[PDB]
Design a protein around this ligand. Structure first.
Ligand SMILES: CC(C)(COP(=O)(O)OP(=O)(O)OC[C@H]1O[C@@H](n2cnc3c(N)ncnc32)[C@H](O)[C@@H]1OP(=O)(O)O)[C@@H](O)C(=O)NCCC(=O)NCCSO
Ligand SMILES: CC(C)(COP(=O)(O)OP(=O)(O)OC[C@H]1O[C@@H](n2cnc3c(N)ncnc32)[C@H](O)[C@@H]1OP(=O)(O)O)[C@@H](O)C(=O)NCCC(=O)NCCSO
Ligand SMILES: CC(C)(COP(=O)(O)OP(=O)(O)OC[C@H]1O[C@@H](n2cnc3c(N)ncnc32)[C@H](O)[C@@H]1OP(=O)(O)O)[C@@H](O)C(=O)NCCC(=O)NCCSO
Ligand SMILES: Cc1cn([C@H]2C[C@H](O)[C@@H](COP(=O)(O)OP(=O)(O)O[C@H]3O[C@H](C)[C@H](O)[C@H](N)[C@H]3O)O2)c(=O)[nH]c1=O
Ligand SMILES: Cc1cn([C@H]2C[C@H](O)[C@@H](COP(=O)(O)OP(=O)(O)O[C@H]3O[C@H](C)[C@H](O)[C@H](N)[C@H]3O)O2)c(=O)[nH]c1=O
Ligand SMILES: Cc1cn([C@H]2C[C@H](O)[C@@H](COP(=O)(O)OP(=O)(O)O[C@H]3O[C@H](C)[C@H](O)[C@H](N)[C@H]3O)O2)c(=O)[nH]c1=O
Ligand code: NA
Lengths: 145, 145, 145
């Protein structure tokens, strides 16, 4: 079985064994979440979303339509994703931009991931980074101060 | 009518037709929100706040006292606003700094807007930007990496 | 007495007189919170956490195991902290990195604080800053654009 906190609103049945979903999360019906994930408090997970096994999503993260997270990924707290490069209110894209975070990658706290991005296997994104270009597998990327 | 999610705490009656306010939002009594807005999950909206029509506020945003959002504005997820330039705990300003986000402007995901800022009509703020100065109408501004 | 909002999940008994904890907060059992604090909506506070007196934590902040906040500190909205410098999903550190935010310091909105950091007494961290090194007492630090 999986653990859905009574204070979460989880509408998806597609949740793997061992997964924990914590307080004040929203998970919409078509989301797919694998086994042994930890979806920490205050997250939002939309419909066209696939999350693999052993994924950690720390607090305050939103996973939009068009985003896939592979197995063993770590997403730091308050990490932000995008599916629309030129957002204008009520101007809905015909197709959302896709992001994929590949197996074992880690995204540091409060990073910002632009739309259409691939982050390669086992990459490490520094805390607070702005990722405007793909990050190669196993690369450590951060936004220099 | 408007749609207030049962899992929101909306204390304002000043909400326009067609507006949606989603799970785990807090809206304090004096907030004014126009028609056909979408206030996504996990937002906080204070009292001295005016939000126009057709405004999109993505998840995880707080709109403080002193902030006005005009019509047709898009605010990306985890965008942060300020009303106090030199904050010190329990040192309450006599007057909060005012921010105005003008008609049709868009603010990218996880941007940070300093206090006292004007963002001009139809401007575009890049994801993750720090906005320390006014942005002119129709300008695209981002914080270079 | 202290004020715990009915829409918060506060599991700690260690909360000082005059403290307010707002909607959609999570506070785990071992957290220590002093007197006259304001823990604004949408915060998460873990177990190995000490927060002093007269502390303001604005919305959307998480205080992890290993973090101490001294008296009279201001933490801006969506400020992010870290306790793991090289995070990998399911690779639990033997010991979390410690952060201390010293008396009277202020952290601007949407700043990112790396693990192992000391922010000195009465320092001021600019909105959106990435703090990768200790900040001396009374220093104003921001990430230049
Ligand atoms: C990116 C990194 C892995 C790099 O660590 P590192 O490779 O040991 O680098 P380092 O020796 O500390 O720093 C090298 C330089 O890069 C800078 N730097 C490191 N991380 C940075 C970041 N996130 N943003 C900007 N600059 C950074 C340092 O200031 C240092 O600069 P100088 O050489 O000018 O002194 C780490 O700093 C980091 O950001 N970790 C993520 C932490 C996190 O977000 N954890 C999740 C939340 S807690 O689970
Ligand atoms: C700012 C922008 C509109 C610019 O798009 P663009 O004008 O097509 O620029 P571009 O050709 O991709 O990039 C030009 C340069 O600016 C850099 N850049 C673009 N956006 C940036 C940003 N947000 N921060 C820092 N640098 C950025 C690029 O890296 C590129 O650098 P080089 O010239 O060195 O390669 C877009 O990148 C962006 O930030 N969009 C907002 C996305 C968002 O937040 N959506 C809301 C959430 S999903 O609804
Ligand atoms: C850091 C600061 C205290 C500095 O204020 P200041 O010392 O009056 O500086 P200033 O005169 O406005 O700016 C000096 C320069 O630093 C830049 N700057 C100021 N704050 C900055 C920031 N946060 N990030 C990047 N650059 C910044 C300005 O753009 C200006 O650049 P130029 O000299 O190139 O014009 C303030 O800008 C700030 O960030 N305050 C925190 C606001 C906040 O987060 N409040 C909490 C939420 S509301 O309670
Ligand atoms: C009990 C409880 C836990 N949680 C979430 C947030 C907690 O940090 C987390 C604890 O689960 P866990 O020990 O499996 O931790 P993880 O989420 O796996 O993260 C820790 O380990 C990582 C490797 C990194 O080091 C990270 N910085 C740590 O926080 O679960 C809630 O959101 N609400 C809760 O009520
Ligand atoms: C069903 C539901 C929706 N919502 C919010 C978050 C959802 O992303 C949003 C869906 O409403 P909508 O289709 O009107 O979307 P908008 O909020 O208008 O945003 C989309 O369109 C923009 C133009 C940009 O492209 C943006 N990146 C998109 O997400 O409503 C909740 O917060 N809780 C919910 O339970
Ligand atoms: C009524 C209510 C308040 N709150 C929180 C968020 C509100 O901004 C805050 C109001 O309490 P307060 O007046 O003691 O304000 P503080 O949290 O102390 O912050 C203000 O004063 C600072 C010095 C800075 O200038 C800051 N930018 C201001 O917001 O309490 C909730 O989260 N939910 C609520 O329902
Ligand atoms: Na943020």
């Amino acid at each position: 079985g999986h653990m859905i906190h009574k204070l979460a609103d989880v509408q998806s049945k597609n949740i793997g064994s061992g997964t924990r979903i914590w307080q004040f999360c929203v998970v919409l019906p078509s989301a797919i979440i694998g086994e042994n994930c930890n979806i920490c408090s205050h997250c939002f997970i939309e419909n066209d979303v696939k999350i693999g096994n052993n994924v950690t999503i720390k607090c305050g993260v939103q996973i939009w339509d068009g985003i896939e997270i592979e197995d063993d990924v770590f997403i730091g707290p308050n990490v932000t994703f995008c599916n629309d490069k030129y957002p204008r209110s009520k101007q809905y894209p015909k197709e959302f931009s896709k992001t994929i975070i590949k197996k074992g990658a880690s995204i540091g706290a409060n990073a910002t991931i632009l739309p259409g991005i691939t982050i390669g296997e086992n990459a490490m994104i520094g805390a607070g980074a702005i990722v405007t270009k793909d990050v190669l597998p196993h690369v450590t990327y951060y936004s220099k101060i």
